[PDB]
Amino acid sequence: GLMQFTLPVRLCKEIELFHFDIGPFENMWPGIFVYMVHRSCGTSCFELEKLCRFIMSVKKNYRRVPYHNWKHAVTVAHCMYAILQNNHTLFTDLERKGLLIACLCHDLDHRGFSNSYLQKFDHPLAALYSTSTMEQHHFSQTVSILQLEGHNIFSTLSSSEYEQVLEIIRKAIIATDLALYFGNRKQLEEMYQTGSLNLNNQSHRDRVIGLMMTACDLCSVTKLWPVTKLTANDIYAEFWAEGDEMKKLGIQPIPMMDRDKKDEVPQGQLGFYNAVAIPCYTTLTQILPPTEPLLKACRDNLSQWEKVIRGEE
Ligand SMILES: Cn1ncc(C(=O)NCCO)c1C(=O)Nc1ccn2cc(-c3ccccc3)nc2n1
Ligand SMILES: [Mg+2]
Ligand SMILES: [Zn+2]
C-alpha cells in the first residue's frame, strides 16, 4: 500500500510529456506502466500482485513482430496516460481504470497482418469476426487473460461497474480499427462545429474515447523526428512482409506493402499525415485543448517528410 514506484529523474520528468520514448530497456516497461496507473488512476485502483501478474500475461501474449509488439502496447498506454493527466477532471474513475488497460491490451496476439490479409488468406478469425477481425480477437484475448486465476484486476468492482469497464475496454479496442476512424472523426467534426457535442451524452463520450484511441495508436507520428523516422522502419518491415504474403497468394499488394516501391515511402507518409494523422490530432485538440502538443509534434514531423522529398535529408 505504501509501496510507490519511482523512476530515475530524467524519466520521472520526461514521462509527463507527450513525446516521451519508453527506451530500449524492456525490463523497465512493466514498472513504467505501473507508475502511470498509480499516478493516473491511484495506488488503490488495483491489487499490485494481481496487476503485476496481469501485465506479465499480457506481455507473454504479444508476439515477436517488428511493430505490433509489447513496446507498441506500452507506447500507446503512455500516450493515453499523457492525455488523461492533461485533462484531470474530464474523465470518470472507471474510464481512467479501463483506458490504460485497453491501450496495453489493444493489439494482443497481433501476427503483423492487416484485417485485409486475414480475409484474402481465408484465416479462421475472418470466419469468426467478419469486420474489425483482429480488434474483436484483441478484445477476446483481453477477456481470456482477465479470467485466468489471480488475474482479475477488477475483482473489487460491483457486477454493473465490472460490465461498464469491460464495455469501455471493448469499444476502445474496436475503435483502434482505422477503417472506423474516418466516419467517427467526421461525426465528431460536425458535432463540434454545430455545437451539439455533449460530454454528458454517453454515445458522445464513446466517440471522443474512440478518437483518443486512434490518437494514442498513431502516436509514432507525434515523437521527436529521430524516433518517428526509426519507428517507420518497423512499420514498413511489417507492411512489406504482408506484401510478400499477398504475392504468395497471387495478388499484387498496394504500393504501401510492396518493398519494390520503397522509393515512394516519403510521398506515402505525406498522404498519411494529410489524410489521417493531422485531421485526427486537429479534431482531438478542438475537443480537448490540452492535447495540442500532439498536433504540434505531428506538424513538425510532416515538415521533416517534406524536407526528405526535397533532398535536404
Ligand atoms: C496504420 N498506421 N499506424 C502507424 C502508421 C505510420 O505509418 N506511422 C509512421 C511512423 O513513423 C500507419 C500507417 O498507416 N502508415 C501509412 C498509411 C498509408 N500509407 C501509404 C504509404 C505508401 C504508399 C506508397 C508507397 C509507399 C508508402 N505508406 C503509408 N503508411
Ligand atoms: Mg491494432
Ligand atoms: Zn496498435
Side-chain angles (χ1 to χ4, degrees), residues 5-23 25 28-40 73-86 100 216 219 222-223 293-294:
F5 281 68
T6 58
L7 306 176
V9 174
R10 193 195 60 87
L11 275 79
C12 177
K13 293 185 201 196
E14 262 101 318
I15 194 174
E16 292 311 314
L17 308 181
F18 282 100
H19 63 263
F20 186 56
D21 179 276
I22 63 175
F25 301 102
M28 287 179 76
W29 299 342
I32 286 161
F33 188 77
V34 171
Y35 182 82
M36 290 194 296
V37 175
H38 281 185
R39 288 190 91 259
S40 226
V74 179
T75 293
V76 166
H78 162 269
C79 191
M80 181 62 71
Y81 168 76
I83 291 175
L84 293 175
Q85 285 309 257
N86 277 273
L100 292 170
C216 294
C219 73
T222 73
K223 303 302 182 193
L294 286 173

Side-chain angles (χ1 to χ4, degrees), residues 244-287:
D244 289 351
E245 294 299 324
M246 287 293 195
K247 293 175 199 179
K248 294 184 193 176
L249 294 174
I251 310 182
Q252 258 302 130
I254 62 185
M256 188 190 324
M257 298 186 185
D258 187 355
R259 65 176 72 253
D260 296 331
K261 308 189 160 137
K262 288 204 185 192
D263 36 291
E264 302 171 48
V265 157
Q267 202 63 59
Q269 284 291 306
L270 277 198
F272 176 72
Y273 277 72
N274 286 317
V276 186
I278 298 292
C280 174
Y281 296 111
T282 301
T283 302
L284 183 65
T285 296
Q286 291 171 186
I287 300 171

Side-chain angles (χ1 to χ4, degrees), residues 81-128:
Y81 168 76
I83 291 175
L84 293 175
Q85 285 309 257
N86 277 273
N87 301 273
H88 184 68
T89 59
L90 275 92
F91 296 105
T92 67
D93 297 36
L94 280 178
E95 285 168 350
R96 285 209 250 71
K97 280 179 170 166
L99 286 177
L100 292 170
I101 299 299
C103 285
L104 195 70
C105 296
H106 83 284
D107 275 325
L108 264 172
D109 190 38
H110 208 285
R111 324 290 172 99
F113 298 116
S114 68
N115 291 335
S116 244
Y117 176 73
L118 286 211
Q119 292 161 12
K120 281 157 191 176
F121 184 82
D122 201 2
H123 196 280
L125 288 178
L128 184 57

Side-chain angles (χ1 to χ4, degrees), residues 62-280:
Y62 277 89
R63 295 184 181 256
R64 290 185 176 93
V65 294
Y67 180 67
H68 289 101
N69 51 44
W70 177 229
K71 186 173 198 169
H72 173 65
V74 179
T75 293
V76 166
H78 162 269
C79 191
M80 181 62 71
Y81 168 76
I83 291 175
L84 293 175
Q85 285 309 257
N86 277 273
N87 301 273
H88 184 68
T89 59
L90 275 92
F91 296 105
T92 67
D93 297 36
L94 280 178
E95 285 168 350
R96 285 209 250 71
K97 280 179 170 166
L99 286 177
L100 292 170
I101 299 299
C103 285
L104 195 70
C105 296
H106 83 284
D107 275 325
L108 264 172
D109 190 38
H110 208 285
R111 324 290 172 99
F113 298 116
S114 68
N115 291 335
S116 244
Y117 176 73
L118 286 211
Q119 292 161 12
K120 281 157 191 176
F121 184 82
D122 201 2
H123 196 280
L125 288 178
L128 184 57
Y129 313 120
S130 37
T131 66
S132 300
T133 303
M134 284 306 309
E135 295 79 18
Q136 299 202 60
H137 182 61
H138 305 314
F139 176 67
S140 170
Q141 293 276 287
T142 307
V143 165
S144 289
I145 291 181
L146 275 172
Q147 286 175 167
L148 267 27
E149 291 235 328
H151 285 63
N152 208 284
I153 55 167
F154 295 122
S155 69
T156 71
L157 272 52
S158 65
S159 177
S160 77
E161 281 182 303
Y162 181 97
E163 176 140 6
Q164 285 182 64
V165 84
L166 266 287
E167 194 68 359
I168 288 168
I169 288 156
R170 186 187 60 77
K171 289 167 183 165
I173 288 182
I174 299 310
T176 60
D177 181 4
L178 211 55
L180 302 180
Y181 152 71
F182 301 98
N184 185 53
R185 192 203 59 86
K186 285 154 192 155
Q187 287 281 209
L188 280 175
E189 191 56 27
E190 291 175 29
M191 280 165 195
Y192 168 83
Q193 286 184 337
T194 71
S196 38
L197 184 57
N198 174 29
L199 295 164
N200 299 332
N201 181 330
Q202 182 57 62
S203 76
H204 285 203
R205 289 190 86 69
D206 292 352
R207 291 204 173 273
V208 168
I209 290 159
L211 188 65
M212 290 160 64
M213 292 300 298
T214 307
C216 294
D217 203 4
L218 299 189
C219 73
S220 57
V221 299
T222 73
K223 303 302 182 193
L224 297 198
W225 171 240
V227 174
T228 298
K229 190 190 175 205
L230 288 162
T231 306
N233 292 336
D234 299 335
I235 291 169
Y236 283 104
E238 289 198 5
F239 288 168
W240 295 335
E242 175 171 333
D244 289 351
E245 294 299 324
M246 287 293 195
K247 293 175 199 179
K248 294 184 193 176
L249 294 174
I251 310 182
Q252 258 302 130
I254 62 185
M256 188 190 324
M257 298 186 185
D258 187 355
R259 65 176 72 253
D260 296 331
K261 308 189 160 137
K262 288 204 185 192
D263 36 291
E264 302 171 48
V265 157
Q267 202 63 59
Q269 284 291 306
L270 277 198
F272 176 72
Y273 277 72
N274 286 317
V276 186
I278 298 292
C280 174

